[PDB]
């Protein structure tokens, strides 16, 4: 039947993420699946604060590295067939997708 199916996207590149979200919102709204927009979740900071000098000597220095992940998810409610058909195709970049049976 028509099941609330959630297409979660997750990435580290804001261009690669966002355009692939747009593609799925066009193709959904084109077929009138009553698609619900992106819910952008808080971007999370991995921090690593460590020595810049091996075998510590000289003026004391450090180095901040960071990775920024991104999450956002589009909620659809439509038959699970046409979703799982169209979702896995038409993705160029290295960007992950996780389909869920139900959440609501």
């Amino acid at each position: 039947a028509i099941h609330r199916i959630r297409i979660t996207l997750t990435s580290r590149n804001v261009k690669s993420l966002e355009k692939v979200c747009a593609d799925l919102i066009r193709g959904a709204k084109e077929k009138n699946l009553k698609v619900k927009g992106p819910v952008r979740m808080p971007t999370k900071t991995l921090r690593i604060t460590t020595r810049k000098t091996p075998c510590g000597e000289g003026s004391k220095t450090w180095d901040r590295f960071q990775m920024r992940i991104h999450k956002r998810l589009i909620d659809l409610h439509s038959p699970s067939e046409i979703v799982k058909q169209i979702t896995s195709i038409s993705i160029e970049p290295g960007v992950e997708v996780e389909v869920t049976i139900a959440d609501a």
Binding site: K44, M67, I69, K71, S88, E96
Partner: protein, 162 residues
Amino acid sequence: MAVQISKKRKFVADGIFKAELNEFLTRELAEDGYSGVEVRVTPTRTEIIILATRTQNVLGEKGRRIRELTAVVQKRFGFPEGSVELYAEKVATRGLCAIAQAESLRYKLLGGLAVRRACYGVLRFIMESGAKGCEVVVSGKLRGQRAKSMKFVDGLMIHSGD
């Protein structure tokens, strides 16, 4: 076959696979003009695009070498059997491929040849292939047991900013 690790840890483990491979290959394909990789997981399949300039020496006769490499990865990281699928790729424009240009200079030198004429020969190729400019350094010994440095530079270069 479950569950599955945290999303934070999901990226770290991918990075470790991306990196380990990239140094595994460099210790075997050095003479074949290695230039990198580009991994892609695809629906129910792995792709590992093994970029090198001369696909000839990578392939071998009856595809022996590519068969060795696929069987290695299938045991080492504990991949599910038959999911792994290798592919090769030849790059066009080889003088923008710094990694391969450096490792080619290595075997020219280790082959037993002078340093100055070798540095010049690699230079004009990477300039000819297209490039604003280019640079070479060789730091270490020669003509005695104190070290020196030898810079060979042509064209433009940048050093600062993003």
